[PDB]
């Protein structure tokens, strides 16, 4: 069982996503195997983008990974190991799986991309560890930043709130 609507305590990335995922195994009558869960974890991550997507990648369940992840979530899931009892123990081993606050977007939603000055934009790109060896004006940066945004978007060190 699970509560259905519990608080995303401990790890909100490593909870809700995998918990929603587990349901999609159960509901659809999917065989819980290392093999089959790995595959579904890849495809289930198609709709997701952002924290979850980073998570997927850390779990090898992405197209940009060679998959093949064993005891790391996949194995316990294959032996009915509900999502709420995995990340809680994972924190004591690794926290990169949980501290995925580097969302699908930066607070570019909070800032106007046209009021800006190239310098600001440079801070943004530096915040996403990139280097524009080909860039010109702020408008150029904006155009570029907008497409690179969901790929990096290293959100400021705070919560969603």
Swiss-Prot record:
Its main location: secreted. Disulfide bonds join 11-98, 14-87, 45-56. One of its GO terms (biological process) is neuron projection development. Induction: Not induced by endoplasmic reticulum stress. One of its GO terms (cellular component) is extracellular space. Keywords: Disulfide bond, Growth factor, Secreted, Signal. Pfam families: ARMET_C, ARMET_N. Trophic factor for dopamine neurons. Prevents the 6-hydroxydopamine (6-OHDA)-induced degeneration of dopaminergic neurons. When administered after 6-OHDA-lesioning, restores the dopaminergic function and prevents the degeneration of dopaminergic neurons in substantia nigra. This is Cerebral dopamine neurotrophic factor. It comes from Homo sapiens (Human).
């Amino acid at each position: 069982q699970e509560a259905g609507g519990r608080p995303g305590a401990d790890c909100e990335v490593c909870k809700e996503f995998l918990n929603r995922f587990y349901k999609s195994l159960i509901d659809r009558g999917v065989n819980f195997s290392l093999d089959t869960i790995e595959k579904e974890l890849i495809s289930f991550c198609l709709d997701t983008k952002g924290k979850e997507n980073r998570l997927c990648y850390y779990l090898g369940a992405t197209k940009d990974a060679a998959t093949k992840i064993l005891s790391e979530v996949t194995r316990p899931m294959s032996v009915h190991m509900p999502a709420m009892k995995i990340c809680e123990k994972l924190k004591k081993l690794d926290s990169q799986i949980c501290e995925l606050k580097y969302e699908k977007t930066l607070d570019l939603a909070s800032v106007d991309l046209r009021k800006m000055r190239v310098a600001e934009l440079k801070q943004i790109l530096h915040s996403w560890g990139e280097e524009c060896r080909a860039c010109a004006e702020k408008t150029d940066y904006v155009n570029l930043i907008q497409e690179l945004a969901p790929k990096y978007a290293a959100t400021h060190p705070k919560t969603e709130l």
